[PDB]
Amino acid sequence: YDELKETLAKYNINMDDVEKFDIKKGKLLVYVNGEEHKIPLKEIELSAGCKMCRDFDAEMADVSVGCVGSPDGYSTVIIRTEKGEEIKNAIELKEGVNLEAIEKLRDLKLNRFKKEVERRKAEDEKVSFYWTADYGGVGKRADGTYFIRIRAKPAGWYSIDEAREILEIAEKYDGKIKMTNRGAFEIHGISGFDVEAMVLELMEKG
Amino acid sequence: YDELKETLAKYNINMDDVEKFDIKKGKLLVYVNGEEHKIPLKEIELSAGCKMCRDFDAEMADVSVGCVGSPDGYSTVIIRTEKGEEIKNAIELKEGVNLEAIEKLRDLKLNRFKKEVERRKAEDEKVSFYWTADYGGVGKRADGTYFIRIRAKPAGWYSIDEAREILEIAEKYDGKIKMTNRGAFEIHGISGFDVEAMVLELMEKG
Ligand SMILES: Cc1cc2nc3c(=O)[nH]c(=O)nc-3n(C[C@H](O)[C@H](O)[C@H](O)COP(=O)(O)OP(=O)(O)OC[C@H]3O[C@@H](n4cnc5c(N)ncnc54)[C@H](O)[C@@H]3O)c2cc1C
């Protein structure tokens, strides 16, 4: 609040008189005593934790609502659960949302997060690797690194090509091979900084 | 017996009058009428089953006795068990056996066996893979090929290099990878003709 008020003070805008705020096209819009003042987002310092955030569209909500992707005066509605489906009784909904506009904001937020994580890695600052729990098969070892379990293939049969692919990915991330008593490859010693990239690489290979 | 008798008849020897036989340095020695006759073993047909034999020195006996590697009028004595050690009480034994003379015949016999198995392979003749039981970790599959179980390493840890070596040997012999519920690599589909060569290769890699 103090940062936004101080920023408004720079443009000679009294916060106590503002009619409405808005954030559109990467700019903050202020409506006070008549016309709307345009302030670039770059010029306002965001809450620090927002730099560590990955979730643009509230992907876990029953229903998510925003302005991006839909005409002005309308709200974008993303229905995700049967509870969220009840909004169809309350609102006359239309199709035609601009899906690519929403995805662009997903990527910009993720790139902001990647820059902040890289900066913490370079500066020896603390990182909580909270997104490892986004993925199945990830466990935390006693020493603060992670193991990644590749779900056992039926009857423990692996093609030579498949096994070689697993070893190549393990080598790339300095992982160590452990064979479980259910016939799975489990790769140990993965840095929290590498877990997401390695899992996606494994998923890409099937 | 009939083959030896007819062979001797060709050299004008009546087997009934023979005083002693000997096999030394590639020859059949025949002592008859106070004479020594030498017949190259190459001119004599051996019993068919000997071509499929691997064991020159009776390697499973309590004590094995022969003439190779010791001076004329002595017997070579290879003691292998505590039962065999009792011969030390019956015989004043001497050291100095020519071990290479014995090894030379081990390898000649093995090479003869390899030639006959290869001949049978080429002719699609019946081979009994009786020597697969010389090695641990070898099992017979339902379809007449074999699996080779690599004894699980402690806690199922394998170096990337170790796993790659196993896969390379599996590939060479057209083997298929199965991971056991004790953390072992088990290689399936190995021909009886290849089992020994493959096991020795794995043993060579440690
Ligand atoms: C901080 C912030 C950033 C946003 N950024 C974007 C964006 O980048 N892109 C985008 O498309 N939309 C964004 N929105 C959402 C958008 O501004 C609207 O809130 C949304 O479209 C709903 O509009 P509405 O007219 O349907 O809701 P309304 O009927 O106006 O109701 C708004 C609801 O928002 C809730 N609310 C308001 N402020 C907050 C807050 N600080 N914390 C929690 N709840 C709050 C109120 O409780 C209210 O129920 C943002 C909203 C906020 C609060």
Residue numbers in the entry:
A (entry chain D), B (entry chain C): 207 to 412
Q: Anything the authors wrote about it?
A:
Here, we present snapshots of this coupled system, named coenzyme F420-dependent sulfite reductase (Group I Fsr), obtained from two marine methanogens. Fsr organizes as a homotetramer, harboring an intertwined six-[4Fe–4S] cluster relay characterized by spectroscopy. The wire, spanning 5.4 nm, electronically connects the flavin to the siroheme center. Despite a structural architecture similar to dissimilatory sulfite reductases, Fsr shows a siroheme coordination and a reaction mechanism identical to assimilatory sulfite reductases.
